[PDB]
Subunit: 115 residues, 3 copies
């Protein structure tokens, strides 16, 4: 199955002025915060990727899937990797998740394919 998401980077930027940490720490774990390096476009991107993951599993971000249930990490070549909780991985019955991100000109977008 597939999920996709497009986010205004500027809209993320203005939500990063909502008690700063209060926003970020809702959807990014500390290690994911390290990955984005304070960069609004990278933050927009992880946000878009988590949304896209929730759409790909057809639940959205609710009480079946939290932002923090979705772990994003990077390959040695900076490729985005995505994993769910080992439990959630079984509850949704997932073999593999494939992800990608891009940004240009005020927009971030992400897409996820789930098996």
């Amino acid at each position: 199955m597939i999920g996709i998401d497009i986010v205004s980077i500027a809209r993320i930027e203005k939500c990063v002025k909502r008690f700063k940490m209060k926003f970020l720490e809702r959807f990014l774990s500390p290690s994911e915060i390290v990955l984005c390096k304070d960069k609004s476009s990278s933050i927009a991107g992880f946000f878009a990727l988590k949304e896209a993951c929730s759409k790909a599993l057809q639940v959205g971000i609710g009480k079946e899937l939290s932002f923090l249930d979705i772990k994003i990490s990077k390959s040695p070549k900076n490729a985005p990797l995505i994993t769910l909780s080992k439990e959630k991985m079984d509850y949704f019955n997932i073999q593999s998740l494939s992800a990608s991100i891009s940004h240009d000109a005020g927009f971030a977008i992400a897409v996820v394919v789930v098996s």
Copy 2:
């Protein structure tokens, strides 16, 4: 196979002032019109999803595939579902269609994966 489409919401809005119904009823069935609730961003989205479906099957919207051959519906959790005519489903030899939509900041985009 995969198809994708990005549409200006504003461009859809200005085509929704082209005898209103004359535009909408070309690509949306009544039930799909109920789903979009007059919202230009949802209409842009279904349009983008139908285009994306036609690209995923590699024919585009012509005389092998009409807009109205593509039925969009929603899951109970508001996930976009896509089906073709039971005939067209065989003519194109499709096992399953997987879809997703998103919009932000003046743009709608959609993607479809066909098996």
Copy 3:
């Protein structure tokens, strides 16, 4: 696996004024140059598709995959087709590549699914 890319058409346009040919001929082969017909939006699109292909294979455009290792061609119905070098196709161990492009309102985007 999946890759996606979004490119500002305008940014491509302004790089098409960087000794014109010096830019284009780095990522487009002559036949691919014929396909885009001088159109900045089509050039943006092939660029986005090549980026998306490199992300889908998880290497990016470096010294494991050049822009010119990725050949884009068109079906009789104008569907984008993508092939790698017969060697690279084995080195990355690829069964099939599926691609799609779209542009509207200053943006091109592309997505690739690799088997």
